[PDB]
XYZ file of N, CA and C in Angstrom:
702
model
N 24.309 -2.126 -2.263
C 25.372 -1.967 -3.307
C 26.422 -3.166 -2.609
N 26.792 -3.373 -1.690
C 27.351 -4.508 -1.406
C 27.033 -5.307 0.024
N 26.806 -6.502 -0.009
C 26.279 -7.304 0.847
C 26.435 -8.391 0.625
N 27.206 -9.219 1.743
C 27.821 -10.675 1.633
C 26.987 -11.592 1.429
N 25.315 -11.308 1.531
C 24.446 -12.372 1.025
C 23.996 -12.197 -0.316
N 24.216 -13.314 -1.296
C 24.055 -12.778 -2.705
C 22.522 -12.844 -2.789
N 21.838 -13.264 -1.615
C 20.152 -13.125 -2.111
C 19.827 -11.861 -1.592
N 20.379 -11.173 -0.862
C 20.042 -9.720 -0.553
C 20.456 -8.968 -1.918
N 21.724 -9.359 -2.410
C 22.255 -8.566 -3.216
C 21.389 -8.476 -4.288
N 20.677 -9.486 -5.075
C 19.658 -9.848 -5.854
C 18.353 -8.741 -5.950
N 17.750 -8.851 -4.551
C 16.732 -7.739 -4.433
C 17.194 -6.338 -4.355
N 18.323 -6.208 -3.777
C 18.819 -4.589 -3.742
C 18.849 -4.025 -5.256
N 19.492 -5.143 -6.097
C 19.888 -4.248 -7.240
C 18.926 -3.804 -8.086
N 17.785 -4.192 -8.205
C 16.549 -3.790 -8.718
C 15.853 -2.451 -7.880
N 16.336 -2.220 -6.995
C 15.761 -0.789 -5.996
C 16.918 -0.049 -5.919
N 17.994 0.352 -6.727
C 18.911 0.867 -6.524
C 18.736 2.394 -6.886
N 18.271 2.438 -7.955
C 17.857 4.114 -7.946
C 16.525 4.278 -8.132
N 15.925 5.321 -8.960
C 14.567 5.528 -8.792
C 13.955 4.633 -9.877
N 12.602 4.342 -9.296
C 12.117 3.293 -10.374
C 10.639 3.717 -10.652
N 10.331 3.324 -11.862
C 8.856 4.559 -12.087
C 7.907 3.490 -11.865
N 6.743 3.918 -11.540
C 5.521 3.152 -10.700
C 4.314 3.366 -11.541
N 3.826 2.392 -12.061
C 2.204 2.537 -12.415
C 1.195 1.708 -11.663
N 0.017 2.314 -11.237
C -0.864 1.773 -10.584
C -2.078 1.504 -11.209
N -3.015 0.635 -11.382
C -4.264 0.256 -12.233
C -5.044 -0.255 -10.483
N -6.359 0.444 -10.651
C -7.464 -0.159 -9.754
C -8.288 -0.128 -10.475
N -9.461 -0.976 -10.781
C -10.482 -1.338 -10.639
C -11.352 -1.581 -9.538
N -12.424 -0.937 -9.241
C -13.199 -0.905 -8.253
C -14.600 -0.950 -8.400
N -15.442 -1.591 -7.499
C -16.867 -1.475 -7.653
C -17.022 -1.257 -6.060
N -17.900 -0.335 -5.414
C -18.230 -0.139 -4.037
C -19.754 0.088 -4.179
N -20.575 -1.055 -3.564
C -21.871 -0.712 -3.538
C -22.399 -0.590 -4.906
N -22.088 -1.097 -5.905
C -22.267 -1.349 -7.215
C -21.846 0.244 -8.159
N -20.984 1.167 -7.113
C -20.487 2.234 -8.130
C -19.304 1.707 -8.823
N -18.966 1.467 -9.932
C -17.691 1.217 -10.437
C -16.924 2.049 -10.826
N -15.724 2.071 -10.895
C -14.680 3.351 -10.582
C -13.374 2.732 -11.395
N -12.376 3.556 -12.099
C -10.990 3.344 -11.908
C -10.078 4.249 -11.733
N -9.041 3.642 -10.976
C -8.036 4.846 -11.056
C -6.871 4.337 -11.270
N -6.112 5.319 -12.122
C -4.433 5.005 -12.631
C -3.918 6.085 -11.658
N -2.623 5.735 -11.526
C -1.478 6.510 -10.971
C -0.356 5.859 -11.497
N 0.446 7.354 -11.563
C 2.100 7.098 -11.906
C 2.809 8.039 -10.870
N 4.265 7.550 -10.898
C 5.299 8.274 -10.014
C 6.396 7.422 -10.169
N 7.155 7.719 -8.800
C 8.482 7.068 -9.002
C 8.511 6.601 -7.358
N 9.462 5.638 -7.325
C 9.727 5.494 -5.792
C 11.218 5.049 -5.392
N 11.601 5.510 -4.464
C 13.316 5.336 -4.494
C 13.368 5.109 -2.851
N 14.069 4.031 -3.120
C 13.805 2.931 -1.747
C 15.128 3.140 -0.757
N 16.131 3.691 -1.196
C 17.254 4.486 -0.788
C 16.658 5.291 0.408
N 15.944 5.961 0.315
C 14.986 6.904 1.318
C 13.929 6.279 1.756
N 13.209 5.229 1.553
C 12.057 5.021 1.570
C 10.840 5.763 1.145
N 11.185 6.471 -0.327
C 10.226 7.565 -0.337
C 9.331 7.517 -1.599
N 8.212 7.480 -1.931
C 7.132 7.396 -2.923
C 6.689 8.514 -3.214
N 6.603 9.230 -4.525
C 5.871 10.138 -5.130
C 4.902 9.643 -6.248
N 3.546 9.740 -5.721
C 2.494 9.332 -6.694
C 1.728 10.249 -7.032
N 0.853 10.597 -8.509
C -0.066 10.932 -8.483
C -1.177 10.472 -8.925
N -2.530 10.203 -8.548
C -3.731 9.165 -9.051
C -4.681 9.738 -9.923
N -5.621 9.419 -10.414
C -6.624 9.993 -11.106
C -7.898 9.034 -11.206
N -8.659 9.419 -10.807
C -9.723 8.658 -10.954
C -10.304 8.732 -12.748
N -10.424 7.655 -13.305
C -10.515 7.931 -15.002
C -12.136 7.867 -15.269
N -12.755 7.414 -14.203
C -14.401 7.429 -14.721
C -14.984 8.461 -14.316
N -14.452 9.654 -13.576
C -15.010 10.488 -13.446
C -14.753 11.190 -11.861
N -16.084 11.066 -11.132
C -16.084 11.355 -9.414
C -15.641 10.275 -8.995
N -14.488 10.170 -8.036
C -14.622 8.965 -7.051
C -15.553 8.893 -6.080
N -16.134 7.462 -6.064
C -17.122 7.524 -5.004
C -16.960 7.237 -3.713
N -15.848 6.927 -3.598
C -15.522 6.937 -1.825
C -14.300 7.897 -1.515
N -13.885 8.628 -0.834
C -12.872 9.390 -0.266
C -11.559 8.908 -0.629
N -11.176 9.805 -1.232
C -9.198 8.996 -1.589
C -8.590 8.532 -0.578
N -8.856 9.400 1.217
C -7.968 8.579 1.998
C -7.883 7.065 2.289
N -9.288 6.698 1.638
C -9.650 5.176 2.108
C -8.746 4.524 1.053
N -8.212 4.839 0.534
C -7.591 4.275 -0.740
C -6.116 3.778 -0.538
N -5.752 4.509 0.447
C -3.892 5.045 0.502
C -3.443 3.697 0.522
N -4.102 2.932 1.476
C -3.074 1.869 1.588
C -3.340 0.653 0.561
N -4.170 1.023 -0.305
C -4.663 0.100 -1.497
C -3.738 0.275 -2.455
N -3.610 1.481 -2.862
C -2.921 2.118 -3.985
C -1.309 1.814 -3.675
N 2.865 -0.150 -2.228
C 4.089 -1.092 -2.619
C 4.914 -1.012 -1.434
N 4.935 -1.514 -0.649
C 5.680 -1.836 0.258
C 7.099 -2.068 0.050
N 7.443 -2.429 -1.333
C 8.800 -2.895 -1.794
C 9.724 -1.631 -2.139
N 9.043 -0.513 -1.628
C 10.077 0.619 -1.382
C 10.144 1.076 -0.310
N 10.034 0.034 0.877
C 10.352 0.672 2.068
C 11.815 0.757 2.273
N 12.242 1.726 2.914
C 13.678 1.271 3.566
C 14.150 0.659 4.379
N 14.639 -0.450 3.906
C 15.457 -1.357 5.224
C 17.031 -1.128 5.671
N 17.133 -0.738 6.536
C 18.078 -0.344 7.548
C 19.622 -1.716 6.920
N 20.452 -1.290 6.604
C 21.414 -2.478 6.311
C 21.301 -3.791 7.481
N 21.314 -3.450 8.610
C 21.698 -4.671 9.406
C 20.229 -5.297 9.420
N 19.118 -4.964 8.828
C 17.647 -5.755 8.373
C 17.496 -6.372 7.274
N 18.164 -6.044 6.045
C 18.248 -6.363 4.125
C 17.716 -7.745 4.589
N 18.150 -8.755 5.472
C 17.616 -10.029 5.405
C 16.273 -10.339 5.649
N 15.559 -9.229 5.906
C 14.157 -9.489 6.393
C 13.129 -9.046 5.504
N 13.864 -8.354 4.185
C 13.044 -7.714 3.260
C 12.322 -8.699 2.285
N 11.071 -9.105 2.795
C 10.485 -10.531 1.804
C 10.133 -9.448 0.472
N 9.886 -8.221 0.810
C 8.835 -7.397 -0.632
C 10.194 -7.350 -1.764
N 11.272 -7.202 -1.551
C 12.231 -7.042 -2.658
C 12.559 -8.349 -2.952
N 12.664 -9.468 -1.938
C 13.386 -10.474 -2.477
C 12.161 -11.350 -3.237
N 11.027 -10.768 -3.303
C 9.981 -11.645 -4.169
C 10.010 -11.087 -5.727
N 10.764 -10.093 -5.922
C 11.183 -9.301 -7.317
C 11.927 -10.072 -8.095
N 11.943 -10.105 -9.644
C 11.375 -9.346 -10.148
C 9.672 -10.505 -10.659
N 9.746 -11.364 -10.317
C 8.382 -11.813 -10.555
C 7.102 -11.558 -9.930
N 7.498 -11.009 -8.392
C 6.279 -10.211 -7.716
C 5.654 -10.952 -6.722
N 4.377 -10.576 -6.040
C 4.194 -10.756 -5.100
C 2.595 -10.445 -5.078
N 1.732 -11.310 -4.604
C 0.407 -10.942 -4.310
C -0.033 -10.269 -2.885
N -0.758 -9.155 -2.897
C -0.875 -8.572 -1.685
C -2.910 -8.508 -1.593
N -2.966 -9.271 -0.345
C -4.878 -9.352 -0.471
C -4.673 -8.573 0.737
N -6.086 -8.201 0.707
C -6.703 -7.380 2.150
C -8.190 -7.555 2.438
N -8.649 -7.671 3.518
C -9.925 -7.154 3.931
C -9.591 -6.004 4.787
N -10.459 -4.769 4.590
C -10.684 -3.681 5.185
C -11.651 -3.484 5.826
N -11.869 -3.862 7.106
C -13.272 -3.303 7.762
C -13.371 -2.142 7.991
N -14.483 -1.299 7.952
C -14.709 -0.103 8.383
C -15.669 0.162 9.314
N -15.405 0.083 10.577
C -15.771 -0.099 11.871
C -17.599 0.591 11.485
N -18.365 -0.073 11.694
C -19.976 0.846 11.738
C -20.466 0.705 10.313
N -19.235 0.264 9.497
C -19.667 0.393 8.152
C -19.442 -0.880 7.128
N -18.796 -0.360 6.032
C -18.715 -1.676 4.693
C -17.370 -2.195 5.002
N -17.201 -3.067 4.016
C -15.526 -3.744 4.104
C -15.437 -3.496 2.596
N -13.899 -3.299 2.196
C -13.361 -3.486 0.940
C -12.311 -4.633 1.156
N -12.391 -5.389 -0.065
C -11.655 -6.630 -0.061
C -11.039 -6.244 -1.581
N -9.222 -6.445 -1.287
C -8.409 -6.205 -2.517
C -7.576 -7.433 -2.722
N -7.209 -7.202 -4.223
C -6.453 -8.475 -4.369
C -5.443 -7.610 -5.369
N -4.360 -7.797 -5.280
C -3.217 -6.871 -6.163
C -2.195 -7.907 -6.487
N -1.840 -7.742 -7.797
C -0.284 -7.941 -8.002
C 0.697 -6.856 -8.042
N 1.851 -7.420 -7.583
C 2.774 -6.192 -7.718
C 4.118 -6.839 -8.454
N 4.311 -6.397 -9.452
C 5.740 -7.113 -10.411
C 6.324 -6.117 -11.432
N 7.168 -6.585 -11.715
C 8.272 -5.350 -12.641
C 7.496 -5.858 -14.147
N 6.936 -4.983 -15.372
C 6.924 -5.175 -16.091
C 7.994 -4.095 -16.848
N 9.187 -5.014 -17.386
C 10.205 -3.951 -18.268
C 11.069 -3.257 -16.621
N 11.368 -2.386 -16.785
C 11.852 -1.472 -15.640
C 10.585 -0.766 -14.888
N 9.308 -0.990 -15.213
C 8.455 -0.284 -14.496
C 7.688 -1.149 -13.207
N 7.710 -0.428 -12.136
C 6.808 -1.111 -11.225
C 5.269 -1.496 -11.261
N 4.807 -2.255 -11.313
C 3.581 -2.080 -11.733
C 2.477 -2.924 -10.459
N 1.554 -1.948 -9.691
C 0.864 -2.699 -9.168
C -0.557 -2.539 -9.452
N -1.502 -3.748 -9.709
C -2.495 -3.913 -10.677
C -3.553 -4.286 -9.443
N -4.531 -3.432 -9.411
C -5.571 -3.767 -8.074
C -6.880 -4.127 -8.313
N -7.564 -5.281 -8.045
C -9.036 -5.319 -8.080
C -9.519 -5.212 -6.806
N -10.458 -4.290 -6.295
C -11.118 -3.913 -5.198
C -12.371 -4.316 -5.436
N -13.276 -4.595 -4.291
C -14.742 -5.058 -3.846
C -15.338 -4.283 -2.810
N -16.043 -3.456 -2.666
C -16.673 -2.990 -1.541
C -18.055 -3.220 -1.331
N -18.544 -3.800 -0.176
C -19.665 -4.013 0.035
C -20.286 -3.897 1.441
N -21.407 -3.511 1.509
C -22.269 -3.355 2.978
C -21.999 -2.116 3.463
N -21.502 -1.098 2.418
C -21.549 0.427 2.956
C -22.730 1.570 3.286
N -22.824 1.792 4.167
C -24.218 2.999 4.389
C -24.036 4.060 3.789
N -25.265 4.482 3.016
C -25.315 5.857 1.977
C -25.048 6.679 2.771
N -25.541 6.652 4.042
C -25.425 8.247 4.574
C -23.841 8.060 5.667
N -23.256 6.896 5.746
C -21.919 6.810 6.550
C -20.529 7.963 5.851
N -19.707 7.764 6.830
C -18.636 8.520 6.690
C -17.954 8.337 5.238
N -18.177 7.109 4.812
C -17.376 6.522 3.284
C -18.278 7.418 2.265
N -19.123 6.890 1.780
C -20.166 6.878 0.769
C -20.664 8.514 1.193
N -20.667 9.075 2.355
C -21.512 10.337 2.676
C -20.170 11.265 2.587
N -18.716 10.960 2.025
C -17.518 11.825 1.838
C -17.302 12.686 3.333
N -17.234 12.054 4.583
C -16.882 13.210 5.739
C -15.822 13.069 6.139
N -14.831 12.447 5.648
C -13.352 12.193 5.977
C -12.469 13.336 5.495
N -11.587 13.647 6.323
C -10.640 15.132 5.962
C -9.863 14.393 4.916
N -9.263 15.509 4.304
C -8.202 14.900 3.400
C -6.763 15.025 3.858
N -6.255 13.914 4.551
C -5.066 14.086 5.504
C -5.070 12.708 5.905
N -3.804 12.098 6.546
C -3.368 11.039 6.944
C -2.740 10.717 7.661
N -2.904 10.145 9.017
C -2.164 9.798 10.338
C -0.800 8.977 9.955
N 0.589 9.201 10.643
C 1.725 8.366 10.680
C 0.945 7.243 11.469
N 1.616 6.295 10.953
C 1.213 4.701 11.628
C 2.233 3.862 11.677
N 2.620 2.867 12.505
C 3.666 1.648 12.373
C 2.702 0.488 12.332
N 3.514 -0.612 11.311
C 2.903 -1.685 11.373
C 3.557 -3.046 11.278
N 2.905 -3.644 12.184
C 3.954 -5.112 12.964
C 3.540 -6.190 11.369
N 4.936 -6.685 11.177
C 5.165 -7.601 10.022
C 5.362 -8.981 10.747
N 4.381 -10.133 10.269
C 5.291 -11.211 10.713
C 5.167 -12.316 9.413
N 6.086 -13.251 9.613
C 6.232 -14.429 8.769
C 4.879 -15.439 8.806
N 4.742 -15.554 7.257
C 3.926 -16.976 7.479
C 4.565 -18.246 6.860
N 5.044 -19.047 7.525
C 6.043 -19.876 6.908
C 5.377 -20.677 6.283
N 4.267 -21.050 6.516
C 3.375 -22.356 5.949
C 2.853 -21.815 4.245
N 2.905 -20.636 4.415
C 2.353 -19.708 2.994
C 3.505 -19.406 2.079
N 4.902 -19.264 2.775
C 5.882 -18.832 1.982
C 5.893 -17.356 1.923
N 4.964 -16.719 3.163
C 4.882 -15.194 3.025
C 4.750 -14.485 4.021
N 4.114 -13.527 4.300
C 3.851 -12.610 5.425
C 2.416 -12.485 5.624
N 2.129 -11.886 6.911
C 0.730 -11.653 6.964
C 0.675 -10.076 8.009
N 0.157 -9.203 8.211
C -0.387 -8.273 9.209
C -1.529 -8.070 9.414
N -1.878 -7.418 10.605
C -3.072 -7.057 10.936
C -3.141 -5.595 11.698
N -3.770 -4.588 11.267
C -3.298 -3.373 11.727
C -4.528 -2.475 11.572
N -4.623 -1.202 12.450
C -5.574 -0.411 12.253
C -5.323 0.952 11.788
N -6.032 1.749 10.775
C -5.883 2.958 10.450
C -6.906 3.945 10.902
N -6.506 5.160 11.554
C -7.488 5.917 11.815
C -7.938 6.991 10.693
N -8.865 6.964 10.267
C -8.923 8.277 9.257
C -9.902 9.687 10.155
N -9.255 10.490 9.929
C -10.101 11.597 10.677
C -11.315 12.005 9.852
N -12.389 12.507 10.815
C -13.946 12.977 10.140
C -13.830 14.265 10.437
N -14.640 14.965 9.829
C -14.599 16.634 9.615
C -15.055 17.083 10.964
N -15.860 16.216 11.869
C -16.201 16.828 12.908
C -15.308 16.435 14.120
N -14.111 16.227 13.890
C -12.984 15.808 14.911
C -13.040 14.480 15.532
N -13.990 13.530 15.137
C -13.944 12.165 15.763
C -13.162 11.282 14.663
N -13.243 9.992 14.902
C -12.232 9.458 13.572
C -13.063 8.230 13.290
N -12.781 7.501 12.212
C -13.139 6.316 11.508
C -12.481 5.375 11.263
N -12.543 4.359 11.982
C -11.285 3.249 12.368
C -11.516 2.518 10.951
N -10.254 1.836 10.284
C -10.548 0.852 9.456
C -9.544 -0.164 9.777
N -10.035 -1.252 10.002
C -8.964 -2.536 10.569
C -8.836 -3.084 9.289
N -7.418 -3.405 9.014
C -6.878 -4.091 7.825
C -6.350 -5.721 8.147
N -6.627 -6.831 7.328
C -5.807 -7.711 7.739
C -5.133 -8.060 6.167
N -4.047 -8.501 6.354
C -3.056 -8.322 4.790
C -2.438 -9.670 5.076
N -2.256 -10.165 3.728
C -1.339 -11.340 3.565
C -0.723 -11.102 2.149
N 0.413 -11.455 2.126
C 1.416 -11.480 1.243
C 1.991 -12.789 0.494
N 1.893 -13.282 -0.648
C 2.577 -14.494 -0.974
C 3.198 -14.162 -2.247
N 4.431 -14.826 -2.602
C 5.109 -14.643 -3.715
C 4.520 -15.491 -4.792
N 4.458 -14.630 -6.104
C 4.159 -15.186 -7.287
C 4.969 -16.728 -7.921
N 6.124 -16.093 -7.941
C 7.056 -17.296 -8.530
C 7.410 -18.519 -7.462
N 8.073 -19.536 -7.629
C 8.458 -20.572 -7.139
C 9.955 -20.544 -6.435
N 10.874 -19.300 -6.986
C 11.942 -19.441 -6.087
C 12.068 -19.098 -4.574
N 13.080 -19.342 -3.865
C 13.168 -18.911 -2.705
C 12.720 -17.218 -2.361
N 12.493 -16.769 -1.194
C 12.063 -15.570 -0.836
C 12.860 -15.512 0.850
N 12.604 -14.168 1.303
C 13.353 -14.025 2.315
C 12.191 -13.920 3.312
N 12.224 -14.989 4.093
C 11.108 -14.640 5.417
C 11.694 -14.231 6.641
N 10.786 -13.073 6.748
C 11.482 -11.949 7.904
C 11.244 -12.283 9.449
N 12.052 -11.925 10.335
C 11.727 -12.154 11.820
C 10.681 -10.916 11.725
N 9.785 -10.783 12.936
C 8.972 -9.982 13.484
C 9.450 -8.398 13.293
N 9.014 -7.674 12.781
C 9.353 -6.474 12.781
C 8.717 -5.412 12.558
N 8.646 -3.612 12.356
C 7.984 -3.094 11.783
C 8.009 -2.206 10.665
N 7.257 -1.525 10.179
C 7.036 -0.583 9.264
C 6.952 0.700 9.891
N 7.794 1.953 9.448
C 7.115 3.268 10.182
C 6.442 3.925 8.753
N 5.221 4.283 8.781
C 4.882 5.234 7.883
C 4.718 6.630 7.890
N 4.804 7.413 6.880
C 4.165 8.620 6.871
C 3.683 9.108 5.394
N 2.261 9.834 5.399
C 1.863 10.039 4.289
C 1.560 11.220 4.018
N 1.679 12.252 3.011
C 1.189 13.681 2.853
C 0.396 13.816 1.618
N -0.829 14.301 1.876
C -1.808 14.392 0.828
C -1.899 15.474 0.301
N -1.998 15.988 -1.127
C -2.135 17.410 -1.495
C -2.728 17.130 -2.775
N -3.310 18.375 -3.661
C -3.821 18.595 -4.965
C -2.781 19.363 -5.602
N -3.162 19.191 -6.984
C -2.445 19.793 -8.077
C -3.205 20.850 -8.713
N -2.780 22.119 -7.992
C -3.512 23.031 -8.369
C -4.150 23.208 -9.997
N -3.217 22.854 -11.098
C -3.767 22.797 -12.207
C -4.631 21.548 -12.946
N -5.038 20.646 -11.960
C -5.689 19.195 -12.421
C -7.061 19.926 -12.576
N -7.745 19.334 -13.390
C -9.410 19.278 -13.067
C -9.759 18.311 -12.586
N -9.258 16.777 -13.196
C -9.999 15.554 -12.734
C -9.864 15.416 -11.325
N -10.517 14.871 -11.081
C -10.550 14.061 -9.448
C -9.354 13.094 -9.258
N -8.536 13.667 -8.040
C -7.337 13.175 -8.343
C -6.361 13.238 -6.603
N -5.514 12.805 -6.366
C -4.721 12.867 -5.251
C -3.145 12.781 -5.413
N -2.677 13.675 -4.871
C -1.067 13.689 -4.798
C -0.556 12.952 -3.482
N 0.319 12.204 -3.561
C 0.802 11.369 -2.475
C 2.263 11.240 -2.194
N 2.732 12.006 -1.156
C 4.149 11.671 -0.772
C 4.295 10.759 0.339
N 4.913 9.616 0.467
C 4.728 8.484 1.360
C 6.142 8.179 1.916
N 6.553 8.241 3.040
C 7.899 7.661 3.260
C 7.568 6.284 4.341
N 8.161 5.248 4.074
C 8.292 4.205 4.960
C 9.557 3.882 5.012
N 9.439 2.996 6.502
C 10.981 2.676 7.143
C 10.478 1.549 7.979
N 11.750 0.521 7.799
C 11.720 -0.593 8.809
C 12.666 -0.422 9.652
N 11.995 -0.912 10.908
C 12.812 -0.890 11.973
C 12.245 -1.840 13.022
N 12.725 -2.197 14.249
C 12.395 -2.420 15.525
C 13.240 -4.282 15.683
N 14.438 -3.989 14.930
C 15.612 -5.069 15.532
C 16.714 -4.247 15.381
N 17.341 -4.576 16.557
C 18.259 -3.700 16.930
C 19.755 -3.871 16.357
């Protein structure tokens, strides 16, 4: 609402209230083609997301928790003293590309590319996902993961050469038998536009996610509440 840096003001202004979100994913995992649509709202003031996702092609062929990181970090809450480090909002409204490779230990990998940008007043995240080399009897295609999600801190670093950011981090998915399925993420983000962006000092994001079901919904779906806060600069 009041920042002495006009570049920060420009990005904050687009995220000042509740912003509607649309998520589209087209996926192919070991030749099972599927699509997911999601709708909800983001409130960057509190770092809060609320989304509901539907598999529009029938039953989702992989477990919903494996898609949480893939299915909008511009809604992170950056403390006032860290707002000059917020790459994600500084790239708006033209947006950014978010690319990942996700390696599931002892199993296959996801390769994702997403464009995150405004269409009018709506923040859209449009994703293509390709998954290969998964085991039919593994934890992913065998749906052995529990329907829950662990809190996680992720380290963000600038990539000055690409005018973007980079991160590598591990997600632990609980398996029904009490064990864990590791998912190693590599991520890079680059701006879509050619204007300047804020390139951050090293810092981390703290995330927490809660998964639930809509008791009146017959389609395969996931309801997601996420909180993300930046930290690590004193």
